Amino acid sequence: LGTADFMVHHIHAFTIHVTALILLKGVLYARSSRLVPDKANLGFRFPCDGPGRGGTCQVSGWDHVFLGLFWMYNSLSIVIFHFSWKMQSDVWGTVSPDGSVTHVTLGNFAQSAITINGWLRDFLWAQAANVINSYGSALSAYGIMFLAGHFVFAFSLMFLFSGRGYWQELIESIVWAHNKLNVAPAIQPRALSIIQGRAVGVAHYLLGGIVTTWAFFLARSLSIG
């Protein structure tokens, strides 16, 4: 353990305390708060108390969990990246019959993992050569999946960055179109609720990110031993 390990362990501490902050604030302030004094009557899962008081979006405990999911993802991603790079750089490798050890990444962790540029070039770029070049071999299913992971992530941003009023109006126009041809459904379509929109966004986001990381790790570790 050295300087880089020190910094990464304290980064872990930071991310964990932040996730605990979000979840603990969600639990403690669920009943009520200074902003909303009767939050308990609105239930656990409600989107907002309205644009009043300057805006009361995401005050329920459910929204606190929704926000904590991202921070859990961030913390665990940093943890698994730390594990992977440190193991590849200082532990895993091969042994010569003399007794010397040759590590997978030649011990570059102790000097590159101290900057963000190191984590970009020497880890995300260098170790992705095994997954991007997987086409045409038995590892192609990972490469595909890798790209698939990079897609769904972006897809989720349609739901996190927007609101249901725009989609309701667009559905109104499309319903007019289906009405002109006498093909409108009896079950009137509606845009997803605010809570449902947040849930869909977080679910597709987590799925995309985790699938990306899984494909990356599997394709990398099936090419070194």
Partner: protein, 142 residues
């Protein structure tokens, strides 16, 4: 003399070199040979891969036109049977209920009577039931 930069794969050295190693998609051991002999009749680029022509010429009609009609018939079938089922289920005192619980007998009855969809649609348009007047449709404020 169109496509002076394109040559048939049968006379393309890149395709001739690269077609000996075509993989087998199924367990059939000759599928690579079948693929090679079928793709020898197309127009290939300098990379030895077939290219398609969709300008409307009938010599390359199999490139787009035949699959075009093949798709169109099926899509029209699906749309027409869906619309017919919805229309017939509307006046059932619970059309919303029968949209989540499918009426299988009527659904299959509409499935079968759906191959003649183009003639039915043409007849319906001439009968005025395919479209509705703009004064009979909900509209949003301007």
């Amino acid at each position: 003399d169109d496509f002076a930069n394109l040559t048939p794969c049968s006379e393309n050295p890149a395709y001739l070199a690269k077609s000996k190693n075509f993989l087998n998609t199924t367990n059939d051991p000759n599928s690579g040979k079948i693929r090679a002999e079928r793709y020898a009749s197309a127009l290939c680029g300098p990379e030895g891969y077939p290219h398609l022509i969709v300008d409307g010429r009938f010599t390359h009609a199999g490139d787009f036109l035949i699959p075009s009609i093949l798709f169109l018939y099926i899509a029209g079938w699906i749309g027409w049977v869906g619309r017919s089922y919805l229309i017939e289920i509307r006046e059932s005192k619970n059309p919303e209920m029968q949209e989540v619980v499918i009426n299988v007998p009527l659904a299959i009855k509409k499935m079968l009577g759906g191959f003649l969809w183009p003639l039915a649609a043409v007849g319906e348009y001439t009968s005025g039931k395919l479209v509705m007047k703009d004064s009979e449709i909900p509209t949003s404020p301007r």
